[PDB]
Amino acid sequence: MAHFKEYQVIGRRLPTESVPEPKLFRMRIFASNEVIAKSRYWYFLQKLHKVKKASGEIVSINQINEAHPTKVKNFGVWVRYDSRSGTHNMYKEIRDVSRVAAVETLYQDMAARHRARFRSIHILKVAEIEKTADVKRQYVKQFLTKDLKFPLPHRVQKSTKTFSYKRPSTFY
């Protein structure tokens, strides 16, 4: 949807005479700005409680900065998505350095692999994976072997002028 921020959002059915101080419910929402994030908040709240923006009220809307933004983390991600033929539940695993960075690339993968646009996707849970060997998918497990190294063959260097008088070399 853009580059993502993560918000804590809090709202509560409008106070009534006979029921003042209603319950307060929170969601963590991944959106690109605070306006979309409250649109989203209300989107899901109406999928659980009887409320709608018209009869409720946001109480607090707060960015949640990554606690350890240079600590490489193995994330497990849980997602609901509709495909063309129907609607399904997935679990993927993203190895990035901050929840917000990873939710970003999830959305890329869903779009690339399963053609799911943003509207069709429900993040259900994103959480850090504490022990290794709770990592399931192998496209992550690769990157947790000990003393790991790898080269980057066939190096291509972006030419700056239209012509060239050498003849390139993909060496690295």
Partner: protein, 136 residues
Amino acid sequence: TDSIVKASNWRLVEVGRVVLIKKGQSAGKLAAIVEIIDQKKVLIDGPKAGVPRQAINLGQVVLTPLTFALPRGARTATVSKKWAAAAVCEKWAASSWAKKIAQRERRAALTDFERFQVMVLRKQKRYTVKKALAKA
């Protein structure tokens, strides 16, 4: 008669691999690969160079042939301490790569007169060498 099988010895993505940034507010600065995120992202940190610890796409950086003993995941202070230890900056500064860089930085900073001064010197150097290229 032994076997004799080529080589192809690549620079590697690995912890403690020093890496020349090429685009950003760092760009032209060295830095080291702390941990390793995936096939295309890495975690770099170059506290000596002033470049901040970050996750960087490997496309915006170029692997140098320098390496040093660095524990995977090592924080910035640890990085600063191991870097100085291996004496990275001298190791790089003295290399034909980093000298060629400084050499063109200089030719860019030449004043119009200094540029005129280079011409006469080359005139002088050429006179004696074109001579020597005729006596042996």
